[PDB]
Amino acid sequence: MMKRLVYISKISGHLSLEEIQRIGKVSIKNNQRDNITGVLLYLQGLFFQILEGENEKVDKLYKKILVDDRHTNILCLKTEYDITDRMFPNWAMKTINLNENSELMIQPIKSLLQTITQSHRVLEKYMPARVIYLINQGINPLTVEPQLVEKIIFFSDILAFSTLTEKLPVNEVVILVNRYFSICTRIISAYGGEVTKFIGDCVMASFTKEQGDAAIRTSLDIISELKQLRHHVEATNPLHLLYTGIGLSYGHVIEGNMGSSLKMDHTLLGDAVNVAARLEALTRQLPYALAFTAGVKKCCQAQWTFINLGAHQEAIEVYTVNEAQKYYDTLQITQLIRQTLE
C-alpha cells in the first residue's frame, strides 16, 4: 500500500544552491533505498515537495523532514491514501529551481503558483488551530461532521480594557493588544492548546481533558510573562498597565463547521463556552487572576493547592490555585491604570 503527501514550507534563512543541491543528493540515495519517489520545488523562499511510496517509508521520512533545520512553517496540504500509480515513478527526488526558469510560456503558471501560495500562507494565520490540524493530517475540514467532545475551554482578556481604549490612542491600543495576543497564542500553542478565535480583547482556546495541568500552567505562564513585561518597559509604555484575567471550564462541546453558504466557521457549541467566559469576568471580583470549574480540577494530576471560591451563578463551584493569587488589589489597579493614563 502506497501513500502520497504534499507539503509546503518556508526556507530557513538563506540557503545557497550547494546546500539545496546537498538536499537533492541525500534525498536521491535515501529515496532509492526506500523506493520513494517525488519532486522538490523551491520558489521565492518557499519549498514544495511531493512524496510517494509505502506508508511506513514515507511517514518515516516525513518525521525526519519535519525536524530538519533548513525549513520552517511546514504545512502538509494533501495526503492521498491507497494510491494505485506513482506520479513521478522515474524520479527518486527531482529538484527543480523555479526561480531560474525564465521560459516565457512557464511564467504564467510560475507567477500564479507564487501568488496563490503566498496568499495561502496569509490565510493560514487566520485559521483556527483545529482547521490547520485537520489539513496537516490530510483531512478536508469542510467534510468533517461535528462531534461531541470533552474540552477544557480557555478565556482570557485584558483588565480594565475599557479604560485603556478610552485613554490610549488607537495605534497604542493596537500595539498593546497585539503583544497580549502574541504572548497568549505562543504559550497556549506551546502547551498543546488550540487557539479558537479572538473576540475583542479576549483569547478563546481549548484543551483536551488530558491537558488539565497544561491549561493551568498556560494560565500561570501568561500571568507570569505579563508581570515580567510590566517591569521590563518604562512608565510611559502602555504595556506597563497590562493585566489579564483567565477563566477555564470543562464540559461537552460540539466542535465542527457551523453556519451557511454566506458564512461558515469553526465553532464550539456548549455550556462550557459560556461558563469559561463568566468565570473569566468573575476574576475581577476575586483575589485570583484564574478561576475554573470543578471539572477542570478533576482533569488535573499535578499537586496544585486548589482553593475553593464558593458557588457562583445552575450555580457552579469556582476553584483556583494558590499560585494564581494576585499580589495586588484589583480595584486599586484599575484606579492606578486610570490615574496613570490621566
Q: Judged by CB, which is closer to Cl ion: 64, or 125?
A: 125
- Residue 198 is a binding residue for a copy of itself (CB under 8 A): yes
322 lies in the binding site for Cl ion (CB under 5 A): yes
Q: Which residues of 110-142 are buried (b: 16+ CB within 10 A; e: fewer)?
A: beebeeebeeeeeeeeeebbbbeebbeebeebe
The cell for 28 is 536521491
Binding mask 275-304 for Cl ion (x = CB under 5 A): -----------------------------x
- Considering beta carbons, is residue 58 or 158 the nearer one to ligand FMN? 58
Q: In the bound complex, what is the minimum distance in angstroms from residue 278's beta carbon to a copy of itself?
A: 11
Q: How many C-beta neighbours within 10 Å does residue 169 have?
A: 9
Q: Which of residues 15-74 bind ligand FMN (CB under 6 A)?
A: 23, 26-27, 30-31, 40, 47, 49, 61, 64-65, 68, 70-71
- CB nearest ligand FMN: which residue? 30
Report the candidate in 280, 281, 276 with the shortest Cα–Cα distance to residue 295: 276
| E strand segments, 128-210 | 147-158, 194-199, 202-208
Q: How many residues bind ligand FMN (CB under 6 A)?
A: 16
Pick from 36, 92, 177, 279 the residue near a copy of itself by CB under 8 A.
Answer: 177
Number of H helices, E strands in the chain: 10, 13
Cα 299 to chain centroid, rounded = 22
Max Cα distance, the chain (Å): 73
Residues 6+ apart with CB under 8 A from 267: 255, 256, 257, 258, 259
**Residue from 8, 43, 46, 93 in contact with ligand FMN (CB under 6 A):** 93
Q: Interface with ligand FMN by CB under 6 A: which residues?
A: 9, 23, 26-27, 30-31, 40, 47, 49, 61, 64-65, 68, 70-71, 93
Q: Interface with Cl ion by CB under 5 A: which residues?
A: 130, 255-256, 304-305, 321-323
